[PDB]
Amino acid sequence: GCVEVDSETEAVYGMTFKILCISCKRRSETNAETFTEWTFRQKGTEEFVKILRYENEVLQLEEDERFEGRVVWNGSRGTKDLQDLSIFITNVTYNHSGDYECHVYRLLFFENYEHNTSVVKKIHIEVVDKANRDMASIVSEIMMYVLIVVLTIWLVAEMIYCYKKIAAATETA
């Protein structure tokens, strides 16, 4: 089916990055016609500005030196019923740090009835010179070692204590 997932936040300078924009419709068996527009606010700037528009399986890129030649489609393809609207940056630079908005305009076609929807997804991307490791992996890596050792010393401690008792009893008689 379709599962909405949020994009990663930190993009490494010099290499690629994928900005996820997934918006699943409530009932999957319905059919609709969707197109998307992306708007971008760079760090140190206040107003959002459009950067590209995708519709009818053809991507249109706005005139922007910071984005020209290094943005390609990465979402749903081969259909007009788009549910994945991601874009792929082939070369991340510090111009790309800022707030993004992924606007989705979806028109649903029912029997003698059509509903024009609209959804806006927000993404905040920060650019770094080197990849970092998430805390969940940092904290868990040490924890499995603490549990492993703390359980290993516990086992031997009981063995020695019971070894003391059993050996003493056997030698008693």
Binding site: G1, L20, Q83, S140, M143, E171
Partner: protein
């Protein structure tokens, strides 16, 4: 003895004097053979009036007649019609005819010819001539009785036998109506079917069976009272919880006031017409009913632009609902009998939320407790050259090798026929033809040689010989005649040779005994079932035959008959046979629409009740009858022609080291710790659903914790190795299983660390983590005992399992010969209509429509079919379980020659193949299985010597204590307060009258709840609030009053605390309900809080001595059912994880939809519980069987790395078949457990 004398007038005169003497101051009955003591009738004293043979009422004005069969008759000596005296020749001639057997045979043959004529929907014109012949015979039969005995005079006369009432009514009704020649045909047509009931009185030995079955009813009144009471309690629970939930619908929202035209026009708006216009609701494309929804977070979702509201009418023409007690009561009778309960299960969950699955788990469990009582209620009542050549051939025939070789050829021949399949290459077909030719010659030569060996044609003809000789003749004629080859059924008779093995396979022979009894000892009981089904088929056809065709547009969209109807006898019979299999709700909806509810409900329930009662009696009778009681020599002639000392330094240390390992491992602290981690690692498997990408953090944590868990279990294995030693460790299966799971985990760990995480073999080895919960089987002693008991019965189950496989193999081969390659059909995908024979007749025309870009035309095949023996076995399993058998049956009756387009019901008489299989492969086969399971579990219990086998030692002492607590009768203290006022109040509150007032007022409270309806007006709701308020006030006064007399002795009685604890729930329930209705609104809590009032109704158990003794018997089985329930949950949990790993992405189709699927642990458990009752397991397997173009191999799933939505048919079949078998074995042990407690209680 030996005293005979014609009844002369002086005999009557003596009688009337004898009565004067008696008044002034016996196994020999009519209709029974005369006892041997009296000897044979004199040479000329037969068929005349005689004197009575007994002193029993010897002085009555009575005389006796005899028959040439030595049967006895009794008559009243008073004249018939005040004219025909016994001494007149008028009586004598009719007496000689009435008693004659030939006279009865004519009547029996008359009714059988009459009942066959009732099967005609529109009889020809000449039927009237035959119709008047019957009435001529029937009217004559009555006359002989009237002229031979009195009409209605007291004593013994025509009308004093109740069966002659029907006979007289049948005859007179024909005269008054037909000769008047006016009436409502469909109304009085049914009274004629009463003629069929004449078979009961005419055929010998059927009157006793029916009389016993009628008196069989009065035993069940105790359980009928129980069943109705409990069904009403759960109907009130279900009514309260689900008022109006089944008419939630997705209606277009918001309202477009500009585009709205009410029916009156004027471009206005009217709300009542808005939520009743069907066009405003959402219907999933391809479905027949609008979609349900719910405002809860776990209920169904509406599309964008729709709102979830109560609109329209309830599903299934309005007959499926909880809006009213009557409709709620029906919905729970359906749930009790498990007829199509998965649809009610799914509809309720889609509107009330998935969290309400607990209600259906509870109702299904208790509903199984009713059935055990019902089964036990009925069980309690059944419980030259000629000589030279002849000797030469006879010397080789009858030799053990000749018999042994021919027996092997029978097995080899059967395996040869299983090789037939479709599509089959010309070379493969040629081998089958040549091989089959040889086999017929071998058996033909065998019978010819044995025909010569035994004197020609005379000594050979005996039981088995005539059969195989008939087969040989049939095969020879089939080889010669094309007309014989015309019909496919003839090849099946070769399969019957497989039973020739019964003489050497006792278990197979045990199946012949069961089948033989059904037409042997129990023939009359079986014949009653045949007559009962025939009458219902005719009765329903007469009442509803017209309606199904006049109102056809009401129940089918195309204005043509459905596939199940009562418009003719054969289709009427099939419906009656269908309800006997347990499917009555679906066919009753159609009948209610056309023929109304009152008359349709009545008849359908009588068939369900009377029909199942007779089937159950036959099934139990067969079981109790089952409980009644040179290969080697031929082989013999073929055979003829290190060990370090412990008493030393290291020996003490090393031996002590092993001793301490044992101490730690066995220590209860260590074992409990390990059990805690088996549940922790097993519970970590449930987080691997389709939403794992949204849980990046939890995925990381559980990934690392897997290292900790697998490290700990490695240490546990090493400690057990030293503590026990390799010899002891590798000797018991429980330690072997724990070793295997650890080894698999290590392989996936070191391999993962090395790399190759994307390897196909490793990925398919990762899915084996679902078996980790099996490590808990030996840690819980409840699970171990149940598993040990199940394994002990495996050797017995296998021997009967083989008979099931061989017996089912014959039906699988026979079905292949009839339906192999005949399930294909040409389908227009874009418009979804199977082409008619005019358009495409065969595969060739379908292909010619596929030329060019016509990608919408497909030559499809039914997924479950008889294309080969392997596929036949799956189809038979779906028929035997009555799940998915409708699609299999529909394709069979439509089938034509191979590679031909199906035509609607072109082969309608193919239904008989499935009728025969159900009777033989399911009804009798299940009889054989239960026959050994009951016997085996008695020997298993006996040889162990214990009273229980599903219970642990700790539970046994608790079980023993509970038995005594239910046997020590309570005392009767009378602690009078010795007070002026409290003395009198104590006296009357303790009188039986005071209890009767309480008991009756609770019943009025119960009825006050049934009056509630979803659509009730406010005024009715306003009234029903005050009435319920009074009952609360009255019942609290009862407690306050008794708590004023028995101030401190209330605790001494177990029911008063229940009365008190049920009371304080009533005041809080009503007072808090008002509070939550104004502040802190929470309707879902309001309904649940209101359920506390039903506690009062449970107080009826206090006085219901009839039902208390069974509710107590339930408590005895709970400790045993808990152990079995645990094992079922473990199996459900293991199969639940397998589903999520395999079927989480298959296409949403058939039985897989957006709420009931394997995408999540909750969804998998919901589906797995549904299958546990084997309910709709065909609709869940079908999507898994898809192959492209039915599915896409590279479909995208946004938010996931998975690709494709195709299933794996091989895994799908293994997954569902394995669970169906396993759940059947466990559930069968559940019934045996509860039945054992009830048997030991009764």
């Amino acid at each position: 003895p030996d005293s005979f004398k014609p009844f002369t007038p002086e005999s009557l005169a003596n009688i009337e004097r004898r009565i004067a003497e008696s008044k002034l101051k016996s196994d020999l009955e009519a209709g029974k053979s005369l006892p041997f003591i009296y000897g044979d009738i004199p040479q000329g004293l037969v068929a005349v009036p005689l004197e009575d043979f007994d002193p029993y009422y010897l002085t009555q004005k009575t005389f006796v007649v005899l028959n040439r069969g030595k049967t006895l008759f009794r008559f009243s000596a008073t004249p018939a019609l005040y004219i025909l005296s016994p001494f007149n020749l008028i009586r004598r001639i009719a007496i000689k005819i009435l008693i004659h057997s030939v006279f009865s045979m004519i009547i029996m043959c008359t009714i059988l010819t009459n009942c066959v004529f009732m099967t005609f929907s529109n009889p020809p014109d000449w039927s009237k001539n035959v119709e008047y012949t019957f009435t001529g015979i029937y009217t004559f039969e009555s006359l002989v009785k009237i002229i031979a005995r009195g009409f209605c005079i007291d004593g013994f006369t025509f009308l004093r036998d109740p069966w002659n009432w029907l006979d007289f009514s049948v005859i007179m009704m024909a005269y008054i109506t037909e000769f008047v020649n006016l009436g409502n045909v469909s109304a009085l047509r049914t009274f004629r079917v009463l003629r069929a009931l004449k078979t009961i009185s005419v055929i010998p030995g059927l009157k006793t069976i029916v009389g016993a079955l009628i008196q069989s009813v009065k035993k069940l009144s105790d359980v009928m009272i129980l069943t109705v009471f409990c069904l009403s309690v759960f109907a009130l629970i279900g009514l309260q919880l689900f008022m109006g939930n089944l008419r939630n619908k997705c209606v277009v929202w918001p309202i477009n006031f500009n585009e709205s035209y009410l029916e009156n026009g004027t471009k206005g708006f009217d709300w009542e017409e808005y939520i009743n216009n069907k066009t405003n609701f959402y219907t999933v494309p391809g479905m027949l009913e609008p979609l349900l929804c719910g405002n809860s977070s776990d209920a169904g979702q509406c599309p964008e632009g729709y709102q979830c509201m109560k609109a329209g009418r309830n599903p299934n023409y309005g007959y499926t609902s909880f809006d009213t007690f009557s409709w709620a009561f029906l919905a729970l009778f359906r749930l009790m009998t498990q007829d199509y309960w998965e649809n009610l299960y799914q509809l309720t969950l889609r509107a009330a939320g998935k969290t309400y699955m607990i209600f259906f788990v509870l109702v299904i469990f208790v509903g199984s407790f009713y059935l055990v009582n019902l089964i036990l209620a009925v069980v309690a009542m059944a419980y030259p050259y000629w000589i030279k050549l002849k000797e030469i051939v006879n010397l080789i025939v009858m030799d053990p090798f000749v018999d042994l070789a021919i027996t092997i050829c029978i097995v080899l021949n059967t395996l040869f026929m299983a090789m037939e399949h479709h599509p089959m290459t010309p070379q493969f077909e040629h081998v089958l033809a040549v091989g089959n030719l040889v086999f017929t010659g071998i058996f033909t030569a065998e019978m010819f040689l044995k025909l010569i060996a035994m004197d020609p044609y005379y000594y050979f003809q005996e039981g088995w010989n005539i059969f195989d000789g008939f087969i040989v003749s049939l095969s020879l004629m089939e080889l010669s005649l094309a007309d014989v080859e015309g019909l496919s059924v003839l090849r099946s008779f070769r399969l019957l040779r497989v039973f020739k093995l019964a003489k050497s396979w006792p278990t197979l022979n045990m199946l012949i005994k069961i089948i033989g009894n059904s037409v042997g000892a129990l023939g009359n009981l079986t014949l009653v079932l045949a007559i009962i089904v025939f009458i219902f088929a005719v009765v329903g056809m007469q009442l509803f035959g017209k309606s199904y065709k006049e109102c056809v547009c009401k129940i089918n969209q195309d204005c043509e008959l459905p596939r199940w109807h009562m418009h003719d006898f054969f289709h009427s019979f099939l419906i009656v046979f269908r309800v006997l299999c347990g499917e009555w709700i679906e066919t009753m909806w159609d009948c209610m629409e056309v023929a109304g509810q009152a008359m349709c409900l009545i008849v359908f329930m009588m068939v369900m009740v009377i029909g199942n009662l007779v089937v159950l009696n036959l099934f139990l009778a067969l079981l109790l009858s089952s409980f009644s009681a040179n290969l080697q020599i031929s082989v013999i002639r073929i055979k003829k022609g290190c060990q370090v000392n412990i008493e030393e330094g290291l020996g003490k240390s090393w031996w002590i080291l092993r001793k301490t390992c044992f101490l730690i491992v066995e220590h209860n602290w260590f074992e409990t710790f390990i059990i805690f981690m088996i549940l922790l690692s097993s519970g970590a498997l449930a987080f691997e659903d389709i939403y794992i990408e949204q849980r990046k953090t939890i995925r990381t944590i559980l990934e690392y914790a897997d290292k900790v868990f697998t490290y700990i279990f490695i240490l546990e294995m090493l400690l057990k190795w030293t503590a026990y030693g390799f010899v002891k460790f590798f000797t018991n299966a429980w330690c072997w299983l724990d070793f295997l799971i650890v080894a698999v985990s290590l392989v996936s760990l070191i391999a993962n660390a090395l790399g190759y995480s994307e390897l196909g073999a490793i990925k398919s080895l990762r899915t084996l983590r679902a078996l980790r919960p099996l490590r808990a089987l030996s840690r819980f002693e409840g699970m171990r005992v149940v598993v040990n008991a199940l394994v002990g019965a495996i050797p017995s189950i296998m021997n009967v399992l083989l008979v099931c496989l061989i017996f089912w193999l014959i039906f699988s081969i026979m079905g292949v010969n009839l339906f192999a390659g005949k399930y294909h059909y040409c389908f227009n995908e874009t418009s979804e209509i199977r082409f008619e024979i005019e358009d495409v007749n065969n595969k060739t025309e379908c292909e010619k429509l596929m030329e060019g870009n016509n990608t919408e035309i497909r030559w499809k095949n039914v997924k479950i079919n008889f294309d080969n023996v392997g596929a036949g076995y799956l189809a038979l399993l779906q028929v035997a379980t009555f799940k998915g058998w409708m699609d299999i049956m529909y394709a069979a009756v439509d089938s034509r020659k191979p590679d031909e387009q199906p035509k609607y019901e072109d082969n309608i008489y193919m239904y008989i193949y499935f009728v025969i299989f159900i009777i033989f492969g399911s009804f009798f086969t299940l009889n054989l299985f239960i026959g050994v399971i009951i016997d085996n579990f008695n020997q298993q219990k006996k040889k162990f010597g214990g009273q229980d086998i599903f219970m642990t030692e700790e539970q046994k002492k608790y079980y023993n204590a509970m038995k005594k607590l239910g046997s020590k009768k309570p005392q009767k203290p009378i602690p009078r307060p010795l007070n002026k006022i409290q003395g009198i109040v104590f006296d009357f509150v303790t009188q039986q009258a005071f209890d009767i007032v309480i008991m009756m007022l609770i019943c009025l409270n119960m009825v006050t709840m049934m009056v509630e309806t979803d659509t009730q007006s406010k005024q009715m709701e306003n009234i029903l609030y005050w009435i319920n308020l009074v009952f609360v006030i009255f019942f609290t006064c009862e407690c306050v009053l008794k708590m004023f007399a028995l101030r401190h002795y209330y605790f001494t009685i177990g029911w008063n605390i229940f009365d008190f604890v049920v009371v304080i729930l009533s005041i809080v329930g009503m007072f808090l309900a008002d509070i939550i209705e104004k502040y802190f609104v929470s309707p879902t809590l309001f309904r649940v809080i209101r359920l506390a009032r039903i506690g009062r109704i449970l107080r009826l158990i206090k006085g219901a001595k009839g039902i208390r003794t069974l509710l107590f018997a339930l408590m005895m089985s709970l400790p045993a059912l808990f152990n079995i329930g645990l094992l079922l949950f473990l199996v459900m949990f293991i199969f639940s994880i397998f589903g999520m790993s395999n079927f989480a992405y298959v296409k949403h189709e058939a039985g897989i939809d957006d709420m009931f699927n394997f995408e999540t642990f909750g969804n998998s458990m919901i589906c797995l519980f549904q299958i546990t009752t084997s309910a709709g397991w065909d609709g869940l397997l079908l999507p898994i069987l898809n192959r492209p173009p039915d599915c896409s191999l590279d479909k995208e799933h946004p938010g996931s790395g998975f690709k494709g939505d195709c299933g794996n048919p091989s895994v799908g079949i293994f997954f569902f078949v394995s669970y169906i078998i396993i759940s059947f074995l466990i559930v069968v042990n559940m019934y045996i457990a509860i039945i054992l407690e009830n048997f030991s209680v009764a």
